[PDB]
Amino acid sequence: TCPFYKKIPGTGFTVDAFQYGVVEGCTAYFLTHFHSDHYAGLSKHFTFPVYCSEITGNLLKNKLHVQEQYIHPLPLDTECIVNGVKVVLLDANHCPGAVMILFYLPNGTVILHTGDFRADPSMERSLLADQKVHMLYLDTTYCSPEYTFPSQQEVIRFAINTAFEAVTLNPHALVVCGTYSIGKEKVFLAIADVLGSKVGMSQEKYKTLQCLNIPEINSLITTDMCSSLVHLLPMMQINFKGLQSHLKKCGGKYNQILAFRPTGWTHSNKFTRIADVIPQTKGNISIYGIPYSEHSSYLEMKRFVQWLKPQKIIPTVNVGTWKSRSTMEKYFREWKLEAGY
Ligand SMILES: OCc1cn(-c2ccc(Cl)cc2)nn1
Ligand code: NI
């Protein structure tokens, strides 16, 4: 059964609700972004209207083979009417094509659904600035003060500098980056750019990246592994056994691997700075875990909510335990009182 927090009251709409069969009274299904926990259920046999971004629509058509007649892409930052209701899609600063959705109910209620997002002060000057929001359906992934991490810019500087140093010292070193979904493309693109290389990858991953409208992508990626010194592999293979195996397949072109795993949060953030990060090393293989997040830190989330001043908050992540729910509600009350309501 579909949970209450995926239903938009006073409308026929659901959000990220494709794994529940036919939802009673749902006339339009919104999809915030192409991550599997959110799209789970869609296929070529889906025959209800799906509303999403242009990039998300490209991925639905080409990767899941959803029929074109049921895909309804909408432009960003533009007032659109869907089944008699005004909606706007806003950039979520998550993965490519990820959106937040503003719904303007007929009775005057305004609802923001963040999907998955990384809150940023730039959002304080979108179409959100223009009106009051009554209800906020909030990505609470990291809603606890222990969740601190650096800016994406600081993390990319560390990765570029580390990779450039390693390959300048040893021109026969290979760089490997892990991936298991769209998002965090800057990690591998920025490293390839500083080394003067394209990023080599499987045919399936190249297909996925061709759906994303990234400027000059044909200039940065390839399926020719032999011509590339930055390789993408499945996240599951970023370990000493899997990387040893990959190195054998390169046929003596390389004698060292430097690998990156771009994880969300890892407790070592609590103790140390980005400048202080060190790898795990065995023989001629080193693995760096880097805290590249596409979700709000606690402080980023707090600032966004204190700026927006919603009347009601509905969490969409960590909702399955009473301890988690109680903890989040205590922070929401703190934020409200500190904002002086
Ligand atoms: O779900 C009820 C609710 C609303 N709020 C809230 C928090 C911060 C600000 Cl600034 C305004 C409202 N907290 N809990
Ligand atoms: Ni996501």
Neighbours of ion ligand 2 (CB under 5 A): 35, 116
Token pair, residue 174, equals 């290979």
> N- to C-terminal Cα distance for the chain?
36
Partners of 33 in the β-ladder: none
**Residue 116 alpha carbon to ligand 2 centre in Å:** 5
CA dist 69 and 311 (Å) reads 38
> Which position has the token pair 């590249």?
292
Ligand nearest to the CA of 31: 2
Token pair, residue 195, equals 């080394």
In the chain, the amino acid numbered 255 is N
Please report the atom of ligand 1 found closest to the CA of residue 335: 8
Q: What is the 3-state secondary structure (H, E, C) of the chain?
A: CCCHHHEECCCCEEECCCCCCCCCCCCEEECCCCCHHHHCCCCCCCCCCEEEEHHHHHHHHHCCCCCHHHEEEECCCCCEEECCEEEEEEECCCCCCCEEEEEECCCCCEEEECCCCCCCHHHHHCHHHHCCCCEEEECCCCCCCCCCCCCHHHHHHHHHHHHHHHHHHCCCEEEEEEECCCCCHHHHHHHHHHHCCCEECCHHHHHHHHCCCCCCHHHCEECCHHHCCEEEEEHHHCCHHHHHHHHHHCCCCCCEEEEEECCCCCCHHHHCCHHHCCCEEECCEEEEECCCCCCCCHHHHHHHHHHHCCCEEEECCCCCCHHHHHHHHHHHHHHHHHCCC
Q: Are 217 and 258 part of one and the same domain? A: yes
**Residue 286 alpha carbon to ligand 2 centre in Å:** 28
Instruction: Print burial letters for 32-66: b (CB count within 10 Å at least 16), e (below 16).
Output: bbbbeebbeebeeebeebbbbbebbbbbbbebeeb
Q: Are 3 and 62 part of one and the same domain? A: yes
User: Which residues, at least 6 apart from 61, have a Cβ–Cβ distance to it below 8 Å?
Assistant: 68, 71
Q: Are 101 and 188 part of one and the same domain? A: no
Instruction: Print burial letters for 301-329: b (CB count within 10 Å at least 16), e (below 16).
Output: bbbbbeebebeebebbbbeeeeebeeebe
How was this entry determined? X-ray
CA dist 123 and 205 (Å) reads 31
Q: Are 37 and 170 part of one and the same domain? A: no
Q: Is 132 in the pocket of ligand 1 (CB under 6 A)?
A: no
Q: Is 335 in the pocket of ligand 1 (CB under 6 A)?
A: yes
Largest CA distance in the chain: 68
Q: Are 163 and 199 in contact (CB under 8 A)?
A: no
Q: Are 278 and 291 part of one and the same domain? A: yes
Token pair, residue 26, equals 């749902």
CA dist 78 and 18 (Å) reads 25
Where among 280, 295, 310 does a domain terminate? 295
CA dist 122 and 125 (Å) reads 6
CA angle 198, 200, 202 (to 5 degrees): 150
CA dist 86 and 79 (Å) reads 7
Q: Are 87 and 173 part of one and the same domain? A: no
Q: Are 91 and 233 part of one and the same domain? A: no
CA dist 3 and 314 (Å) reads 12
Q: Which residue has its alpha carbon closest to ligand 1 atom 6?
A: 336
Q: Are 90 and 227 part of one and the same domain? A: no
Closest to 27 in 3D by CA, of 107, 104, 83, 66: 83
Q: Are 1 and 139 part of one and the same domain? A: yes
CA dist 59 and 76 (Å) reads 17
Ligand nearest to the CA of 301: 1
Give the structural domain span for 107: 1-147+296-341
Q: Is 332 in the pocket of ligand 1 (CB under 6 A)?
A: yes
Token pair, residue 202, equals 């499987």
Domain count, the chain: 2
How far apart, in Å, are the Cα atoms of 58 and each of 39, 65, 68, 209? 14, 10, 10, 11
CA dist 18 and 334 (Å) reads 35
Q: Which residue has its alpha carbon closest to ligand 1 atom 11?
A: 309
CA dist 30 and 50 (Å) reads 6
Q: Are 135 and 15 part of one and the same domain? A: yes
Which CATH number is 77's domain given? 3.60.15.10
Please report the atom of ligand 1 found closest to the CA of residue 329: 14
Resolution value (Å, 1 decimal): 1.5
Which CATH number is 204's domain given? 3.40.50.12650
Cβ burial of 224 (10 Å; 0-12, 13-18, 19+) is: exposed
**Residue 91 alpha carbon to ligand 2 centre in Å:** 13
Phi-psi region of 332 (alpha: psi -120 to 50; beta: other; left: phi over 0): alpha
Q: Is 298 in the pocket of ligand 1 (CB under 6 A)?
A: no
User: Which residues, at least 6 apart from 318, have a Cβ–Cβ distance to it below 8 Å?
Assistant: 140, 141, 143, 324, 325, 328
Ligand nearest to the CA of 312: 1
Q: Are 233 and 178 in contact (CB under 8 A)?
A: yes
Token pair, residue 5, equals 């927090």
230-234 vs 199-200, strand pairing mode:
parallel
Q: Which residues precede chain breaks (C–N over 2.5 Å) in the chain?
A: none
Q: Are 136 and 164 part of one and the same domain? A: no
Say what angle helices 185-195 and 152-169 make with each other, to 10 degrees.
40
Q: Are 252 and 312 part of one and the same domain? A: no
Ligand nearest to the CA of 36: 2
